[PDB]
Design an enzyme around this catalytic site. Sequence first.
Site, PDB file in Angstrom:
ATOM      1  N   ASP A 159      29.725  20.262  33.554  1.00  0.00           N
ATOM      2  CA  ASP A 159      30.328  20.345  34.682  1.00  0.00           C
ATOM      3  C   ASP A 159      29.907  21.690  35.247  1.00  0.00           C
ATOM      4  OD1 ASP A 159      31.979  22.230  33.077  1.00  0.00           O
ATOM      5  OD2 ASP A 159      33.784  21.038  33.001  1.00  0.00           O
ATOM      6  N   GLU A 169      33.955  20.690  25.903  1.00  0.00           N
ATOM      7  CA  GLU A 169      33.225  22.203  25.618  1.00  0.00           C
ATOM      8  C   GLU A 169      32.168  22.005  24.660  1.00  0.00           C
ATOM      9  OE1 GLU A 169      34.363  24.856  27.519  1.00  0.00           O
ATOM     10  OE2 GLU A 169      32.364  25.468  26.652  1.00  0.00           O
TER      11      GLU A 169
HETATM   12  C1  LIG Z   1      37.799  22.898  38.154  1.00  0.00           C
HETATM   13  C2  LIG Z   1      38.438  24.146  38.184  1.00  0.00           C
HETATM   14  C3  LIG Z   1      38.823  25.039  37.194  1.00  0.00           C
HETATM   15  N1  LIG Z   1      39.412  26.307  37.134  1.00  0.00           N
HETATM   16  C4  LIG Z   1      39.727  27.280  35.985  1.00  0.00           C
HETATM   17  C5  LIG Z   1      40.872  26.708  35.140  1.00  0.00           C
HETATM   18  C6  LIG Z   1      40.286  27.080  33.843  1.00  0.00           C
HETATM   19  O1  LIG Z   1      40.932  28.316  33.445  1.00  0.00           O
HETATM   20  P1  LIG Z   1      40.965  29.092  32.005  1.00  0.00           P
HETATM   21  O2  LIG Z   1      39.833  29.245  31.633  1.00  0.00           O
HETATM   22  O3  LIG Z   1      41.664  30.531  32.426  1.00  0.00           O
HETATM   23  O4  LIG Z   1      41.937  27.974  31.458  1.00  0.00           O
HETATM   24  C7  LIG Z   1      38.716  27.065  33.858  1.00  0.00           C
HETATM   25  C8  LIG Z   1      38.603  25.775  33.424  1.00  0.00           C
HETATM   26  O5  LIG Z   1      37.046  25.637  33.811  1.00  0.00           O
HETATM   27  P2  LIG Z   1      35.993  24.993  32.420  1.00  0.00           P
HETATM   28  O6  LIG Z   1      35.937  25.221  30.755  1.00  0.00           O
HETATM   29  O7  LIG Z   1      34.460  25.384  32.820  1.00  0.00           O
HETATM   30  O8  LIG Z   1      36.927  26.193  31.866  1.00  0.00           O
HETATM   31  O9  LIG Z   1      38.625  27.290  35.128  1.00  0.00           O
HETATM   32  C9  LIG Z   1      40.106  26.650  38.284  1.00  0.00           C
HETATM   33  O10 LIG Z   1      40.914  27.806  38.384  1.00  0.00           O
HETATM   34  N2  LIG Z   1      40.004  25.588  39.186  1.00  0.00           N
HETATM   35  C10 LIG Z   1      39.224  24.439  39.463  1.00  0.00           C
HETATM   36  O11 LIG Z   1      39.259  23.889  40.316  1.00  0.00           O
HETATM   37 CA   LIG Z   2      34.764  22.052  30.929  1.00  0.00          CA
END
Ligand SMILES: Cc1cn([C@H]2C[C@H](OP(=O)(O)O)[C@@H](COP(=O)(O)O)O2)c(=O)[nH]c1=O
Ligand SMILES: [Ca+2]
Length: 135
Positions: free
Chosen positions: A15, A37
């Site tokens: 993603d 992940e």
């Molecule tokens: C898709 C998305 C992810 N995110 C954030 C939430 C998560 O924060 P935290 O890392 O603080 O939990 C992280 C998830 O992405 P993925 O693993 O790429 O993390 O990115 C947003 O803020 N908004 C969104 O629309």
């Molecule tokens: Ca992810």
Amino acid sequence: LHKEPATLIKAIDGDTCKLMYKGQPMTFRLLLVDTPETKHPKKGVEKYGPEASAFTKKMVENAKKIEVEFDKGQRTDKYGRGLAYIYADGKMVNEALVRQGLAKVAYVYKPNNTHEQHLRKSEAQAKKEKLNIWS
Ligand SMILES: Cc1cn([C@H]2C[C@H](OP(=O)(O)O)[C@@H](COP(=O)(O)O)O2)c(=O)[nH]c1=O
Ligand SMILES: [Ca+2]
């Protein structure tokens, strides 16, 4: 919503990827989905993570055209990542992953949820078909 052209620089995981948008490099993160992940240690290499990465990599790297569609709210997250619906030859990558059971519908922050229902329908179909993550 309006689509805009972009060019693939490098696929990172299921993603997240680096795209050239408006002649500028940017890492983008798919809206409304979460693939497993493969990087962060305090998460580990989750099952279907390597699969989601390959599905995505194949799809975007073999595409003639890549387009980004921002939703109606904020366009970047706290990490400075672009937030969009990404299309490979007209196929939305976010939905494709969900339909295949390679991602779950996650992070639904309004008003960035225009395609929420379409996606949920696709996820329900993958669940009933017991695909990957749902098996
Ligand atoms: C898709 C998305 C992810 N995110 C954030 C939430 C998560 O924060 P935290 O890392 O603080 O939990 C992280 C998830 O992405 P993925 O693993 O790429 O993390 O990115 C947003 O803020 N908004 C969104 O629309
Ligand atoms: Ca992810």
